[PDB]
Amino acid sequence: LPARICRDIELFHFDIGPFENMWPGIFVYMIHRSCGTSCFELEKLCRFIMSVKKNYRRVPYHNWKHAVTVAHCMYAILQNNNGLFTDLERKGLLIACLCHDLDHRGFSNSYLQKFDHPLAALYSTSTMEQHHFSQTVSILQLEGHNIFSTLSSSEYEQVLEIIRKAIIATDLALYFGNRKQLEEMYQTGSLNLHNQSHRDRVIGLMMTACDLCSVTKLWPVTKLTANDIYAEFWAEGDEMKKLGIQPIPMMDRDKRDEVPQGQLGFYNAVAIPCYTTLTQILPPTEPLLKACRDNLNQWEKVIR
Ligand SMILES: COc1cc2ncnc(N3CC[C@@H](Oc4ccc5ccccc5c4)C3)c2cc1OC
Ligand SMILES: [Mg+2]
Ligand SMILES: [Zn+2]
């Protein structure tokens, strides 16, 4: 509601600030603007939001702030591509973004597999992401939390499927193949948004874009966010060392001087191709790409 947030929330590079109690109203505002004050019952939605918050953990990066920030990036993409996605897709994607890291411990799928965690026996591929979706469903199934209760049974199954595919697509290992397919479709002119399977890929890429969006903020935000990202990675690295396994250098706090080189690698192999491809499909997302490039230049600056 405050006037500065009113204006600035429309910017792709908005940062949601340090006042946690404001983040729910920020999410409600985004969801009402992206699909009527009259869709979700307000008391039901508020109850849902607080239970989601509660099942996020106090880890350095994959926390409740990240969830809302990823939702905000989705809001921004959707607001600047009016008319492409249906009411149902927009509601589903925003809720998917809010829920997409539920009950995250700060550890990757690879660590969970190497640790032999029970979640890895339950869900062999995209382990944390299948968990995040299971948590979403369990929250929806609590008395008073079914924010989709006015939908038909068919539309409910539809939106849950939208949410499921969107959360799964946040498994970055899936992004490389997805992005390759989308680039082949762009270049041959075969991409068709009326084709559900194509549409699903586009939405997947949007989920990657939102999930990575720390690299599309202004430099001071991007830089400070990277401290939280590496704080989790280095903790996992420590855990890897404790299982008897040399971690990759990105996770090795002893190789912390190579952070800039590591960022260069990531921007070159992941972030820039991600936002390049997104911009080709959805040209109004260009500010994400531009901000990404500016941050690549800042990292190159750090190296000199
Ligand atoms: C802004 O900085 C970020 C932001 C991130 N957000 C989400 N997930 C990340 N990691 C998950 C597993 C890792 O997967 C890679 C795939 C391809 C690579 C190519 C080159 C370098 C690193 C790479 C990491 C990357 C990640 C890493 C980052 O910097 C190193
Ligand atoms: Mg995740
Ligand atoms: Zn995430």
Short mmCIF file of N, CA and C in Angstrom, two decimals, residues 43-102:
data_model
loop_
_atom_site.label_atom_id
_atom_site.label_comp_id
_atom_site.label_asym_id
_atom_site.label_seq_id
_atom_site.Cartn_x
_atom_site.Cartn_y
_atom_site.Cartn_z
N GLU A 43 -9.61 -13.94 3.52
CA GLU A 43 -9.27 -14.59 4.80
C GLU A 43 -8.60 -15.97 4.58
N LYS A 44 -9.12 -16.70 3.60
CA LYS A 44 -8.56 -17.96 3.16
C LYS A 44 -7.13 -17.75 2.64
N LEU A 45 -6.94 -16.76 1.77
CA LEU A 45 -5.64 -16.51 1.14
C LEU A 45 -4.62 -16.12 2.20
N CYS A 46 -5.03 -15.27 3.15
CA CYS A 46 -4.14 -14.82 4.20
C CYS A 46 -3.68 -16.00 5.05
N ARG A 47 -4.62 -16.88 5.39
CA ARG A 47 -4.35 -18.10 6.16
C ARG A 47 -3.34 -19.02 5.42
N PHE A 48 -3.50 -19.11 4.10
CA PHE A 48 -2.66 -19.92 3.25
C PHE A 48 -1.24 -19.33 3.26
N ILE A 49 -1.15 -18.02 3.07
CA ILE A 49 0.14 -17.35 3.00
C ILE A 49 0.94 -17.56 4.28
N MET A 50 0.29 -17.43 5.45
CA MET A 50 0.98 -17.58 6.74
C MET A 50 1.41 -19.01 6.99
N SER A 51 0.64 -19.98 6.54
CA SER A 51 1.10 -21.38 6.70
C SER A 51 2.29 -21.71 5.79
N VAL A 52 2.33 -21.08 4.61
CA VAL A 52 3.45 -21.23 3.69
C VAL A 52 4.70 -20.64 4.32
N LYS A 53 4.61 -19.41 4.76
CA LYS A 53 5.67 -18.74 5.51
C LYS A 53 6.26 -19.62 6.58
N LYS A 54 5.38 -20.22 7.38
CA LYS A 54 5.74 -21.09 8.51
C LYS A 54 6.52 -22.34 8.13
N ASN A 55 6.28 -22.87 6.94
CA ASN A 55 7.01 -24.04 6.48
C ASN A 55 8.19 -23.71 5.62
N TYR A 56 8.50 -22.44 5.43
CA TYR A 56 9.87 -22.04 5.02
C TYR A 56 10.80 -22.03 6.24
N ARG A 57 12.09 -22.30 6.03
CA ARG A 57 13.06 -22.37 7.14
C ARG A 57 13.98 -21.18 7.19
N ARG A 58 14.64 -21.00 8.33
CA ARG A 58 15.55 -19.89 8.55
C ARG A 58 16.94 -20.27 8.00
N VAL A 59 17.04 -20.47 6.70
CA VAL A 59 18.33 -20.71 6.06
C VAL A 59 18.77 -19.43 5.39
N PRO A 60 20.04 -19.33 5.00
CA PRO A 60 20.55 -18.07 4.48
C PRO A 60 19.91 -17.56 3.18
N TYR A 61 19.55 -18.45 2.27
CA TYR A 61 19.09 -18.01 0.95
C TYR A 61 17.73 -18.57 0.52
N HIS A 62 17.58 -19.90 0.53
CA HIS A 62 16.33 -20.52 0.09
C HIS A 62 15.25 -20.42 1.19
N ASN A 63 14.87 -19.19 1.48
CA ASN A 63 13.99 -18.85 2.58
C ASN A 63 12.72 -18.11 2.09
N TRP A 64 11.94 -17.65 3.03
CA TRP A 64 10.69 -17.02 2.73
C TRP A 64 10.91 -15.76 1.89
N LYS A 65 11.98 -15.01 2.15
CA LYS A 65 12.30 -13.84 1.31
C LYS A 65 12.53 -14.22 -0.16
N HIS A 66 13.17 -15.35 -0.38
CA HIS A 66 13.48 -15.78 -1.75
C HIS A 66 12.18 -16.11 -2.48
N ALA A 67 11.29 -16.79 -1.77
CA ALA A 67 10.01 -17.22 -2.31
C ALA A 67 9.20 -16.04 -2.80
N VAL A 68 9.11 -15.01 -1.97
CA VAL A 68 8.34 -13.83 -2.33
C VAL A 68 9.01 -13.06 -3.45
N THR A 69 10.34 -13.03 -3.47
CA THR A 69 11.12 -12.32 -4.48
C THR A 69 10.95 -12.99 -5.85
N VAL A 70 10.93 -14.32 -5.88
CA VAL A 70 10.69 -15.10 -7.08
C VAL A 70 9.24 -14.85 -7.55
N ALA A 71 8.30 -14.76 -6.62
CA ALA A 71 6.91 -14.43 -6.99
C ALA A 71 6.84 -13.03 -7.57
N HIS A 72 7.57 -12.11 -6.98
CA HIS A 72 7.56 -10.78 -7.53
C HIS A 72 8.11 -10.73 -8.97
N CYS A 73 9.17 -11.47 -9.25
CA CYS A 73 9.70 -11.48 -10.62
C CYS A 73 8.63 -12.00 -11.57
N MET A 74 7.89 -13.03 -11.15
CA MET A 74 6.83 -13.58 -11.99
C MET A 74 5.70 -12.55 -12.25
N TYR A 75 5.28 -11.87 -11.19
CA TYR A 75 4.37 -10.76 -11.28
C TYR A 75 4.80 -9.76 -12.34
N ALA A 76 6.08 -9.39 -12.31
CA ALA A 76 6.62 -8.42 -13.25
C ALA A 76 6.59 -8.91 -14.69
N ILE A 77 6.96 -10.17 -14.92
CA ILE A 77 6.89 -10.76 -16.24
C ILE A 77 5.43 -10.74 -16.72
N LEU A 78 4.52 -11.18 -15.86
CA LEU A 78 3.11 -11.28 -16.23
C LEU A 78 2.45 -9.93 -16.50
N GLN A 79 2.78 -8.94 -15.68
CA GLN A 79 2.29 -7.58 -15.87
C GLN A 79 2.74 -6.92 -17.18
N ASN A 80 3.93 -7.28 -17.64
CA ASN A 80 4.49 -6.71 -18.86
C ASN A 80 4.27 -7.56 -20.12
N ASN A 81 3.54 -8.67 -19.97
CA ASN A 81 3.12 -9.53 -21.08
C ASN A 81 1.60 -9.79 -20.97
N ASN A 82 0.84 -8.70 -20.84
CA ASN A 82 -0.61 -8.74 -20.65
C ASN A 82 -1.24 -9.52 -21.84
N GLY A 83 -2.14 -10.44 -21.53
CA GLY A 83 -2.91 -11.13 -22.55
C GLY A 83 -2.34 -12.45 -22.99
N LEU A 84 -1.14 -12.82 -22.55
CA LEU A 84 -0.57 -14.10 -22.99
C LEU A 84 -1.06 -15.30 -22.16
N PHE A 85 -1.08 -15.12 -20.83
CA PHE A 85 -1.46 -16.17 -19.90
C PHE A 85 -2.86 -15.96 -19.36
N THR A 86 -3.59 -17.06 -19.15
CA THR A 86 -4.96 -17.04 -18.59
C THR A 86 -5.00 -16.69 -17.10
N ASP A 87 -6.19 -16.32 -16.62
CA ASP A 87 -6.41 -16.00 -15.22
C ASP A 87 -5.85 -17.12 -14.36
N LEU A 88 -6.16 -18.33 -14.76
CA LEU A 88 -5.82 -19.51 -14.03
C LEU A 88 -4.29 -19.76 -13.99
N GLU A 89 -3.63 -19.54 -15.12
CA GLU A 89 -2.19 -19.68 -15.20
C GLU A 89 -1.51 -18.64 -14.31
N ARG A 90 -2.02 -17.41 -14.32
CA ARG A 90 -1.41 -16.33 -13.57
C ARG A 90 -1.55 -16.61 -12.07
N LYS A 91 -2.74 -17.00 -11.61
CA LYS A 91 -2.95 -17.38 -10.20
C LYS A 91 -2.08 -18.58 -9.79
N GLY A 92 -2.10 -19.63 -10.60
CA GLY A 92 -1.25 -20.80 -10.40
C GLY A 92 0.26 -20.51 -10.35
N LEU A 93 0.78 -19.74 -11.30
CA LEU A 93 2.20 -19.41 -11.32
C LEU A 93 2.64 -18.58 -10.10
N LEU A 94 1.82 -17.63 -9.68
CA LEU A 94 2.14 -16.84 -8.52
C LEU A 94 2.18 -17.69 -7.26
N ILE A 95 1.20 -18.57 -7.08
CA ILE A 95 1.18 -19.50 -5.96
C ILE A 95 2.33 -20.52 -6.04
N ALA A 96 2.65 -20.98 -7.25
CA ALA A 96 3.78 -21.88 -7.47
C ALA A 96 5.10 -21.21 -7.03
N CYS A 97 5.30 -19.96 -7.43
CA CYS A 97 6.46 -19.19 -7.04
C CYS A 97 6.57 -19.05 -5.50
N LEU A 98 5.46 -18.74 -4.87
CA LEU A 98 5.43 -18.62 -3.42
C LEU A 98 5.74 -19.94 -2.75
N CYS A 99 5.39 -21.06 -3.38
CA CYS A 99 5.55 -22.33 -2.71
C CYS A 99 6.78 -23.10 -3.17
N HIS A 100 7.56 -22.58 -4.12
CA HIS A 100 8.39 -23.45 -4.94
C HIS A 100 9.62 -24.03 -4.22
N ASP A 101 9.98 -23.46 -3.07
CA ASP A 101 11.10 -23.95 -2.22
C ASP A 101 10.65 -24.37 -0.80
N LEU A 102 9.38 -24.78 -0.66
CA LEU A 102 8.83 -25.05 0.66
C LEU A 102 9.69 -26.11 1.38
#
